[PDB]
């Protein structure tokens, strides 16, 4: 029944955090956890394609997108598979992650196992921007921390 | 308790020059580090937070970098306005602790600003002498 995964965020800067993934049957993937050292506000949160950490977070590559769609928010139909929108940090610099999603998975063709979670400098505009960039990255800006997604207990 | 240590303790530089203060923590503070600037007889001002992010309304000549235990503030092209004491603060662990400051003054080659400075220095002296009168006047009223 139950697949579990885990992800430890790391970067050059002050950002840290552990993300947990649970998925029962082929129900939704429940993402949870905590991210620290953020500035107050919204921060783009996406599964990128590669779990390649050889060159920091740059080597993770673009948003995980097997259906060759354009970038969007989590509720859009036109979205990347990885596009999980925004996490929200308070005045304490902390974000509590709580996300449920159906397009991502912990097995099969849409598995995120062995790929990278990335939290971003700015807010993800959900693809509703005034430029080319918005339908690629959502103008979330630079990558503060990332981690490969591993199999958990 | 984390000891943050700055160097140099003071320094001089000419206009246009590139300046680099450092701050060294006695343990890893994971870039939880803020830089404050304090001009003479004025309140502190926030330059940089989380090691490298500029605050609002800060000239871009100011830049910050570093990680682990060792960090630095860099003014790229020094204007005359920038003569001040600079302070690093860590907020990774409590209590929050602060460097002892680097004083920065000009080398080589704005009149009313002297008046508040002088009035402030005189008021120090007045209250100094008022505290010396205070005991004597208490003794008189007995």
């Amino acid at each position, epitope marked *: 029944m139950e697949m579990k995964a885990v992800c430890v965020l790391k970067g050059q800067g002050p950002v840290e955090g552990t993300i947990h993934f649970v998925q029962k049957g082929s129900g939704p993937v429940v993402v949870s956890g905590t991210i620290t050292g953020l500035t107050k506000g919204e921060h783009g949160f996406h599964v990128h394609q590669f779990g390649d950490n050889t060159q920091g977070c740059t080597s993770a590559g673009p948003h995980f997108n097997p259906l060759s769609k354009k970038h969007g928010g989590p509720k859009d139909q036109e979205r990347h598979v990885g596009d999980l929108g925004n996490v929200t940090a308070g005045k304490d610099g902390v974000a509590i992650v709580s996300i449920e999603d159906s397009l991502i998975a912990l097995s099969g063709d849409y598995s995120i196992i062995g790929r990278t979670m990335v939290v971003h400098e700015k807010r993800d505009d959900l693809g509703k921007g005034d430029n080319e960039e918005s339908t690629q990255t959502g103008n979330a800006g630079s990558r503060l921390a990332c981690g490969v997604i591993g199999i958990a207990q | 308790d984390i000891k943050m240590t700055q160097s140099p303790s003071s320094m001089y530089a000419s206009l246009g020059e590139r300046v680099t203060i450092t701050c060294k923590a006695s343990q890893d503070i994971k870039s939880y580090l803020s830089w*404050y600037q304090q001009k003479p007889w004025k309140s*502190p001002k926030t330059l940089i937070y989380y090691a490298t992010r500029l605050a*609002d309304g800060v000239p871009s000549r100011f830049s910050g970098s570093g990680s682990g235990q060792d960090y630095s503030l860099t003014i790229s092209s020094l204007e005359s306005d920038d003569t001040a004491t600079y302070y690093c603060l860590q907020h990774r662990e409590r209590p929050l602790t602060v460097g002892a400051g680097t004083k920065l003054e000009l080398k080589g080659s704005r009149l009313l600003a002297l008046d508040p400075m002088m009035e402030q220095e005189i008021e120090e002296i007045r209250q100094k002498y008022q505290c010396k009168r*205070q005991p004597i006047l208490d003794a008189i009223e007995a």
Partner: nanobody
Framework: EVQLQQSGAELVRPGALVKLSCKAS????????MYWVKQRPEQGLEWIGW????????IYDPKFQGKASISADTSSNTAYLQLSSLTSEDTAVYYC??????????WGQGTSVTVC
């Protein structure tokens, strides 16, 4: 247009209590933390403590826990610092500031306290 107005100069007898204030305009102090910072003459900054006005939770440096007491009135949008058992060690300039946990966005002009 943000501003922190601090109370005026104080001059007190040893052992006196004194209560400094910080009146904020331009932001709701509930959305921030209100910090207090001491600077002795010809010396650097020491951080005293902060309050979260949203729940009145206060962190202090142990050096000052007992001498110093930080409080906020969310209605008048004002923060307070109370120094007790004052000695010459306490003669200093006290700055109030407001910001997230990771920066001070706003600083007061500072209140001098002198102890005889």
């Amino acid at each position: 247009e943000v501003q922190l107005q601090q109370s005026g100069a104080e001059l007190v007898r040893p052992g006196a209590l004194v209560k400094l204030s910080c009146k904020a305009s331009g932001f709701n102090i509930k959305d921030y933390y209100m910090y207090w910072v001491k600077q002795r003459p010809e010396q650097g900054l020491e951080w005293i403590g902060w309050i979260d006005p949203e729940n009145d939770n206060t962190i202090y440096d142990p050096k000052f826990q007992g001498k110093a007491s930080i409080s906020a009135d969310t209605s008048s949008n004002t923060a307070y610092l109370q120094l007790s058992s004052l000695t010459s060690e306490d003669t200093a300039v006290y700055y109030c500031g407001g910001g997230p946990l990771y920066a001070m966005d706003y600083w007061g002009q500072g209140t001098s306290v002198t102890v005889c």
